[PDB]
């Protein structure tokens, strides 16, 4: 990340061994479940591209997934260059990816006074795009084929419903609640849920199926 | 959270990996047992809404539960906007600004640390989530206080813990005690403390 | 706890997640053995009643034990109210010291004005915890007798562990040691006893 | 690393016990898998050559590996002295063998980044070790008859990372083998997607 | 320990959960082997008697050992009162230094006026711990004899391990080394002895 | 170590529970393998002799090794006194640098004085590393001559045992490495000609 010294200058601070190991453990445990996105965003908070590359390269397995991320980064870096053909140069696509830029150069870009480019946040946005492709990828089933098992508790069916929905806005969710959640529930709950009338909250539904 | 830099300015500090894992492990282990409420309040203490959403979004399972929280948060945000109707300075925070959905890290700090009309969006948003979390504690409570009956050979100590654990999730203690203790408990006369009861059944 | 900001004002500081887990693990690991009393006192050091309630409420199990504590707290709060009947803070009631009817800020004003509401509430809880330590004590000190081939070292530790939860040491010692201990007369130090039985 | 004391002077900072043990555990756990390179670069971040030698010398096993590193360091030290005839730092000064902590700070804070240069040399030796402990060749990575393409892709790029470790400009032509060594059911699907399809498009079409 | 607030005054700082567990784990793991002495001095470094009693009281087992320590503390406290008989603070008694009749604040003023009551009380406890280290020493130095096929290096470690709890080294060595050791003449260092017995 | 208080004065700061346990665990796990030397220098960095003695005395086993160290410390302290015969501190003797006859405060004044600053902390660390090296060679069981590749041992593992033993005692002679390899590799290794790097050798025996 970036920090200010006693002198008031913007200097680089190395990513901590704790944060790096926390990221390694997260990818090993949480695979590419939807919660890997906020885990990445939290651990990469305030990081410059130099720090972020350390995180990605430190992952041991999942090398096919990391290859998908690196492909996505090249696409976004190319799109950047397309719209962006003793002072500091303007950052290229590879400069934002930290592959052709140094720690110090990345700090100058984020903290300069005129035309401040947050290269850290942009590169984080590129990686979230690749992670979203992987999160969508390890969830095969679509929200339409999420039907409550004959002897599945309604609590657990609701979690599979919204987990799958998460892998895919706030409003497109509300279209699935009143048309797919009630439709795909098992016959024991569909009778009870339709008996609560329209406009019932999700809380009122989960209690009525307990 | 918020911290002061070397110059004395109020700047954002990212939530620590320690705190984040402590909250993630807590939800994994404690489901929505009653003790999840004080854990959130302790771990999110001093957090801005940006930090708090990271905690909620880091949860892996319980996505149906989190949707109940999002309903409660929107309801409370509506109450805010209703009682807080809408160049150069920051805007006045809306309901969604306190929920951190339409406001940034910097804006949240400006609201909390400004000398004029300091609105603590972090504490307000924590209050909204505790309301949603309280709804979940009742929901994952399996047993009713009535089906907690002492086993024929169950120690009274362990029976008392299952009794008050169930009571926590949402004259009766003596009725549901096993036949051996019921004779002993009624023999202690009225007004006996829980200490006296646990000793007389050991 | 309480801290001073850059302006020099008394403000509330959140109990640390480390300290909270230390208390949670202590209750999980040390049950209600006698050493839970110093553990509570150390981990709740400098805490206002708001902080202490976070500690008690964070415990998952042991709810029967916590119910005994709240009975003790109500009794002590009543004793407070009995002896303590515009623009300034009210005088704290029993429940204000228990943090149930008082806020974080009110608790700081009381302590830093000069009524230490934090330490008083700790005294009430230690009183309740003492009742639980005696309660989970399985064996009575009278039924602590030295095994036939038990070393005097281990018997003494097992003896005083029981004594901690709530002339007899020499009586319940094995036959080999009682002769040696009675031959030293009464008033010999425990060092002299432990050396003479090794 | 280098830090400023209360007076504002550049003084040596002792490497922390946390960082040192993290590196010790990393070598114990990660052997010479490819991810040992980022571990070293992250844990040696901001380090002077004095600090870096403490990390290398703290390793318990793998003494044959360190001898490969020490050969590589001497090879790079010779190249340095050849192109570069306090004093001005020699090749051995960057390795921290003939220079002191204070001298290394003077060089870095003028400006020759002796810490970063010596890290660059050690990454060269560690890359040689990553390639060496790589068991399987990329040619013998073929998709199983009932192996899911997802799992085949991960074994493929695990192996591919291990042998392109010692390469400066990585050879992107080798990935074509992924389609060649894939099982007959997916090769039909992959040849049906034509060349230039992204790895995402391949992994979706084989699930 | 003692710290200075923003105003520059000496105020009490509570012992950290990290330090307290380090002390609890140490006594659990290292029993009363000789290395418990330096462990205590490091973990109780800078502590006032209030802090030190927290450490001792947090120990769960070893209650017979702690009972010997508390005996020694009273003896030293009596010796203090023996040699140390309005508006300002009283002069500290033996029990005041032991933290049994003195508060956190009183202890700090004494040290920060002087009298290092923390260091004195640590010194008294080291006396009791030394009595315990000698007491849990099982074997005497004479029954530490080099095995017939024991390497001299390993014999030396058992020799000085036992010797630490409370010219002989050469006597108790096996016949194979005694020939070599006596043949090196007197005044040879222990280093020289270990090379000649390898 | 030494730190500055709010007043700006040089005062002693107690060694951290983290560092001390790290040192205790290090000696328990790493015995007297060569890697014990870096652990000591890193964990004792910035320490005064008072702190360092706390580290040594906290070690539970290896009391014969510590007895060798105390001889070496006394030997080096004598060398100091031989070459180093009203209001401020005395000048430090050999035993003062070993922390046996000097206090915490005395050690700090010596290290932090502007004029004639004697770094008693670093000097005593040098004496102990000298003794610890003697123990590293001593727990080295085998001599470099009896390190021969097993009949079915992979050359990789033989190289590690070779240089581990060599580290315990700058000769820089690899003539034994090729000589003591098993007959299958010696044929291949001698066939690579002189001047081949260790990388090329380890690759050619895989």
- Distance, in Å, from the CA atom of D50 to the CA atom of D14, rounded to the nearest integer, reads 10
Q: How far is A113 from chain B (nearest CA, A)?
A: 18
Name the residue of chain F whose CA is nearest to E35's CA.
F58
Burial (CB count within 10 angstroms: exposed 0-12, middle 13-18, buried 19+), residue B101: middle
Chain-centroid distance of CA E112 in Å reads 25
Residue B65 CB-half CA count within 13 A: 23
Other C-beta atoms within 10 Å of C145: how many?
14
For B141, the token pair is 């409570």
Please indicate whether, in this complex, the C-beta atoms of E17 and C42 are within 8 angstroms of each other: yes
What are φ and ψ of residue C127, in 5° steps?
A: -60, -40
Whole-number CA gyration radius for chain A:
23
- Distance, in Å, from the CA atom of F72 to the CA atom of F68, rounded to the nearest integer, reads 6
Other C-beta atoms within 10 Å of E85: how many?
6
Burial (CB count within 10 angstroms: exposed 0-12, middle 13-18, buried 19+), residue F115: exposed
- Distance, in Å, from the CA atom of D108 to the CA atom of D116, rounded to the nearest integer, reads 9
Count H helices and E strands in chain B, helices first: 11, 2
- Residue A11 DSSP class: E
Chains with 3+ CB–CB pairs under 8 A to A are B, D
Q: Are C157 and E65 in contact (CB under 8 A)?
A: yes
Burial (CB count within 10 angstroms: exposed 0-12, middle 13-18, buried 19+), residue A151: exposed
Count H helices and E strands in chain A, helices first: 11, 2
Other C-beta atoms within 10 Å of C102: how many?
22
What are φ and ψ of residue C130, in 5° steps?
A: -60, -40
What are φ and ψ of residue C89, in 5° steps?
A: -75, 145
Smallest CA-to-CA distance from F23 within E56, E38, E165 is with E38
Concatenate the DSSP letters of all residues of D28-95 into one string: HHHTT-TTHHHHHHHHTTT--HHHHHHHHHH--S-HHHHHHHHHHHHHHHHHHHHT---PPP-HHHHT
For D89, the token pair is 């730092």
Contacts within 8 Å (CB) and 24+ apart, F101-107 = F102/F49, F103/F50, F104/F12, F104/F48, F104/F50, F105/F12, F107/F48, F107/F49, F107/F50
Q: Are E161 and F62 in contact (CB under 8 A)?
A: no
Q: Are B11 and B4 in contact (CB under 8 A)?
A: yes
- Distance, in Å, from the CA atom of F26 to the CA atom of E77, rounded to the nearest integer, reads 39
Please indicate whether, in this complex, the C-beta atoms of E64 and C189 are within 8 angstroms of each other: no
Extended strands (E) in F37-195:
none
Residue C8 contacts E where some CB pair is shorter than 8 Å: yes
Q: Which helix (H) or strand (E) holds A10?
A: strand A10-12
Collapsed DSSP state (helix, strand, coil) of residue F12: strand
- Distance, in Å, from the CA atom of F21 to the CA atom of F44, rounded to the nearest integer, reads 12
Collapsed DSSP state (helix, strand, coil) of residue F137: helix
CB-closest option in E45, E46, E161 to F61: E161
Chain-centroid distance of CA D12 in Å reads 26
Residue E46 contacts F where some CB pair is shorter than 8 Å: yes
For B80, the token pair is 């805010």
For D61, the token pair is 């096993």
- Residue E197 DSSP class: T
Spell out the residues 6+ positions from residue F53 whose beta carbon is closer than 8 angstroms to its own.
E38, F98, F99, F100
Q: Looking at beta carbons, which residues of chain B come within 8 Å of C57?
A: 35, 37-38
- Distance, in Å, from the CA atom of C159 to the CA atom of C143, rounded to the nearest integer, reads 10
- Distance, in Å, from the CA atom of E57 to the CA atom of C35, rounded to the nearest integer, reads 7
Residue E54 CB-half CA count within 13 A: 27
Residue A17 contacts B where some CB pair is shorter than 8 Å: no
Extended strands (E) in chain F:
2-4, 10-12
Spell out the residues 6+ positions from residue A98 whose beta carbon is closer than 8 angstroms to its own.
A48, A49, A50, A52, A53, A106, A123
Smallest CA-to-CA distance from B6 within D8, A186, F45 is with D8
Residue spans of alpha helices (H) in E6-116: 17-30, 36-43, 49-58, 63-83, 94-97, 104-112
Burial (CB count within 10 angstroms: exposed 0-12, middle 13-18, buried 19+), residue C175: exposed
Smallest CA-to-CA distance from A97 within A133, A116, A70 is with A70
- Distance, in Å, from the CA atom of C40 to the CA atom of C125, rounded to the nearest integer, reads 9
Q: Are E31 and C154 in contact (CB under 8 A)?
A: no
Collapsed DSSP state (helix, strand, coil) of residue F11: strand
Other C-beta atoms within 10 Å of B126: how many?
18
Q: Tell me the pairing of strands A2-4 and A10-12.
A: antiparallel
Angle between the N-to-C axes of helices F120-138 and F63-82, in degrees from 0 to 180, rounded to the nearest 10: 130
Other C-beta atoms within 10 Å of D108: how many?
20
Smallest CA-to-CA distance from D166 within D205, D129, D127 is with D127
- Distance, in Å, from the CA atom of E17 to the CA atom of C18, rounded to the nearest integer, reads 8
**Whole-angstrom distance between the N-terminal and C-terminal Cα of chain E?**
50
For A110, the token pair is 């984020």
Residue E57 CB-half CA count within 13 A: 17
Q: What is the CATH number of the domain that holds C11?
A: 1.10.375.10
* Residue D196 backbone zone (phi > 0: left; psi -120 to 50: alpha; other: beta): left
D32, D33, D36, D37 alpha-carbon torsion, rounded to 10°: 100
Concatenate the DSSP letters of all residues of B11-57 into one string: EE-PPPHHHHHHHHHHHHHHTT-TTHHHHHHHHTTT--HHHHHHHHH
Collapsed DSSP state (helix, strand, coil) of residue E154: helix
Residue C108 CB-half CA count within 13 A: 13
- Distance, in Å, from the CA atom of A120 to the CA atom of E185, rounded to the nearest integer, reads 73
Collapsed DSSP state (helix, strand, coil) of residue F110: helix
For C37, the token pair is 């009393």
Spell out the residues 6+ positions from residue E64 whose beta carbon is closer than 8 angstroms to its own.
C153, C156, C157, C159, C160, C190, C194
- Distance, in Å, from the CA atom of B135 to the CA atom of B65, rounded to the nearest integer, reads 9
Collapsed DSSP state (helix, strand, coil) of residue E144: coil
Whole-number CA gyration radius for chain F:
23
Interchain touch D–E (≥3 Cβ pairs closer than 8 Å): no
Spell out the residues 6+ positions from residue A3 whose beta carbon is closer than 8 angstroms to its own.
A10, A11, A12, A13
Contacts within 8 Å (CB) and 24+ apart, F185-193 = F185/F149, F185/F155
- Distance, in Å, from the CA atom of D149 to the CA atom of D146, rounded to the nearest integer, reads 9
Spell out the residues 6+ positions from residue E127 whose beta carbon is closer than 8 angstroms to its own.
E72, E76
Smallest CA-to-CA distance from A186 within A159, A163, A209 is with A209
Question: Which sign, positive or negative, has the C-alpha torsion B159, B160, B161, B162?
Answer: positive
Q: Are C94 and C76 in contact (CB under 8 A)?
A: yes
- Distance, in Å, from the CA atom of E180 to the CA atom of A61, rounded to the nearest integer, reads 58
Concatenate the DSSP letters of all residues of A88-119 into one string: PPPP-HHHHTTSS--HHHHHHHHH-SSS---H
Residue C43 contacts B where some CB pair is shorter than 8 Å: no
Residue C189 contacts E where some CB pair is shorter than 8 Å: yes
For A3, the token pair is 């920090």
- Distance, in Å, from the CA atom of E12 to the CA atom of D176, rounded to the nearest integer, reads 69
Spell out the residues 6+ positions from residue B197 whose beta carbon is closer than 8 angstroms to its own.
B156, B160, B173, B185, B188
Q: Are D78 and D9 in contact (CB under 8 A)?
A: no
- Residue A179 DSSP class: I
What are φ and ψ of residue D32, in 5° steps?
A: -130, 40
Q: Are E174 and E148 in contact (CB under 8 A)?
A: yes
**Whole-angstrom distance between the N-terminal and C-terminal Cα of chain C?**
49
Other C-beta atoms within 10 Å of E88: how many?
6
Please indicate whether, in this complex, the C-beta atoms of A206 and B54 are within 8 angstroms of each other: no
- Distance, in Å, from the CA atom of F104 to the CA atom of A81, rounded to the nearest integer, reads 62
Bridge partners of residue E137, in order along the sequence:
none
* Residue A98 backbone zone (phi > 0: left; psi -120 to 50: alpha; other: beta): left
Residue D103 CB-half CA count within 13 A: 16
For A17-55, what is the HEC assignment? HHHHHHHHHHHHHHCCCCCHHHHHHHHCCCCCHHHHHHH
CB-closest option in E17, E60, E136 to C35: E60
Residue D52 contacts F where some CB pair is shorter than 8 Å: no
Locate tokens 């393998």: which residue?
F33
Concatenate the DSSP letters of all residues of C112-133 into one string: H----HHHHHHHHHHHHHHHHH
CB-closest option in C38, C45, C195 to E135: C195
Q: Determination technique for this PDB entry? A: X-ray
E31-43 as b/e: b if 16+ CB within 10 A = ebbbbbbbbbbbb
- Distance, in Å, from the CA atom of B1 to the CA atom of B109, rounded to the nearest integer, reads 9
Q: How many residues does chain F have?
A: 206
Please indicate whether, in this complex, the C-beta atoms of C71 and B30 are within 8 angstroms of each other: no
Q: Looking at beta carbons, which residues of chain E come within 8 Å of C163?
A: 63
Give, in order, the Cα–Cα distances in Å from C156 to each of A65, C137, C144, C148, C193: 62, 17, 10, 14, 10
What are φ and ψ of residue B12, in 5° steps?
A: -80, 140
Please indicate whether, in this complex, the C-beta atoms of A19 and B20 are within 8 angstroms of each other: no
Residue D154 contacts A where some CB pair is shorter than 8 Å: yes
Please indicate whether, in this complex, the C-beta atoms of A162 and B20 are within 8 angstroms of each other: no
E152-E157-E161 Cα angle (round to 5): 150
Q: Which helix (H) or strand (E) holds A71?
A: helix A63-82
Q: How far is D18 from chain F (nearest CA, A)?
A: 9
- Helix/strand/coil percent split, chain A, to 5: 60, 5, 35
Locate tokens 């030394």: which residue?
E130
Q: Looking at beta carbons, which residues of chain C come within 8 Å of B4?
A: 6
Please indicate whether, in this complex, the C-beta atoms of A42 and B63 are within 8 angstroms of each other: no
Collapsed DSSP state (helix, strand, coil) of residue E29: helix
Residues of the domain holding F75 = 2-139
Name the residue of chain C whose CA is nearest to E53's CA.
C38
- Distance, in Å, from the CA atom of A184 to the CA atom of A166, rounded to the nearest integer, reads 17
D121-D124-D130 Cα angle (round to 5): 145
Collapsed DSSP state (helix, strand, coil) of residue E2: strand
Q: Looking at beta carbons, which residues of chain E come within 8 Å of C2?
A: none
Q: Are A77 and A96 in contact (CB under 8 A)?
A: yes
């Amino acid at each position: 990340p970036i920090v200010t010294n006693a002198q008031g200058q913007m200097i680089h601070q190395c990513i901590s061994p704790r944060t790096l190991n926390a990221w390694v453990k997260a990818v090993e445990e949480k695979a590419f479940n939807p919660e890997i996105i906020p885990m990445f965003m939290a651990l990469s908070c305030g990081a410059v591209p130099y720090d972020i590359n350390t995180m990605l390269n430190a992952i041991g397995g999942h090398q096919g997934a990391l290859q998908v991320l690196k492909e996505v980064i090249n696409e976004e870096a190319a799109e950047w260059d397309r719209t962006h053909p003793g002072q500091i140069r303007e950052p290229t696509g590879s400069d934002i990816a930290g592959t052709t830029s140094t720690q110090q150069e990345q700090i100058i870009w984020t903290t300069r006074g005129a035309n401040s480019i947050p290269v850290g946040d942009i590169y984080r946005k590129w990686i979230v795009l690749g992670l979203n492709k992987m999160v969508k990828m390890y969830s095969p089933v679509s929200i339409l084929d999420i039907r409550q098992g004959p002897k599945e508790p309604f609590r657990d069916y609701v979690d599979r419903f919204y987990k799958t929905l998460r892998a895919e806005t706030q409003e497109v969710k509300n279209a699935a609640t009143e048309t797919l959640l009630v439709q795909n529930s098992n016959p024991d709950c569909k009778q009870i849920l339709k008996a609560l009338g329209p406009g019932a909250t999700l809380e009122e539904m989960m209690v009525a199926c307990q």
